[PDB]
């Protein structure tokens, strides 16, 4: 049997599609990039289904954002960051988060160019 459907040449794994874009962009152009391909920035929801994230080098924008007013981290789809998924680490004053293995989120200035990971379910 097959994995997908996914965008062409994307990683496919447990009903999820992934692509690692090595072009450095700030969080917002990264978001725009994933959108333009009918996808979103990486959403971490399961250590098991997304266990491949354990062996990813370097740092990459994911879809986690801090809304200062409620003091909470949430994904692009509005869902709250589920507990015991990511270790959030203060690094730079900012409202966005870089994914780093193993299942870490480094707080970073949304304006800082970084590589990024797009994700598309099903």
């Amino acid at each position: 049997s097959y994995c997908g459907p996914c965008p062409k040449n994307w990683i496919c794994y447990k009903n999820n599609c992934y692509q690692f874009f090595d072009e450095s962009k700030n969080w917002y152009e990264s978001q725009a990039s994933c959108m333009s391909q009918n996808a979103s920035l990486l959403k971490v929801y399961s250590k098991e289904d997304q266990d491949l994230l354990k062996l990813v080098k370097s740092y990459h924008w994911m879809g986690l954002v801090h809304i200062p007013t409620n003091g909470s981290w949430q994904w692009e789809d509005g869902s709250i960051l589920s507990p015991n998924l990511l270790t959030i680490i203060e690094m730079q004053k900012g409202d966005c988060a870089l994914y780093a293995s193993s299942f870490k989120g480094y707080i970073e200035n949304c304006s800082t160019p970084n590589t990024y990971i797009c994700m598309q379910r099903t």
């Binding site: 080098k57 203060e90 690094m91 730079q92």
Partner: protein
């Protein structure tokens, strides 16, 4: 046992700044970096085409990723020391942060070069070079050193 140490220094004295890195194998310097160029400082590193170019990139990025804020403070010396140790097949690690030569570990609330240096140095080093990498480099470098015809 063996140890591979990296000593990152950023010295801001008035209007000029100096970025340097020293790589020591067993308390002996083998590589140095002056902010621009990297070079071997031991015979067995001459002609190396693996570690020098890798470190040149990691070291340059380490400094260029540091978002230093300008200050009215005329002198700031920042040091980041990172060492991995392979002894009895066991991997252990050590890191220190110095501000004007004085060790510190506690982050304060104010936005300063001292705080940013503390909270981002390990991050800026380990982007492409984690602890396991340091140990594997260490073992590979011990190999070169022991096979040195000098």
């Amino acid at each position: 046992g063996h140890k591979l140490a990296f000593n990152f220094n950023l010295e801001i004295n008035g209007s000029d700044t100096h970025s340097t890195v020293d790589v020591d194998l067993d308390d002996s310097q083998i590589i140095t970096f002056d902010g621009k160029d990297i070079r071997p400082t031991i015979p067995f590193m001459i002609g190396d085409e693996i570690f020098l170019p890798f470190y040149k990139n990691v070291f340059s990025e380490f400094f260029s990723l540091f978002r230093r804020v300008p200050t009215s403070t005329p002198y700031e010396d920042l040091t980041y020391f990172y060492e991995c140790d392979y002894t009895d097949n066991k991997s252990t690690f050590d890191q220190d942060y110095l501000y004007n030569g004085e060790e510190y570990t506690v982050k304060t609330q104010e936005a300063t070069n001292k705080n940013m240096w503390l909270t981002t140095s390990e991050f800026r080093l380990k982007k492409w070079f984690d602890g396991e990498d340091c140990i594997m480099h260490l073992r590979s470098l011990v190999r070169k050193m022991e096979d040195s015809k000098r």
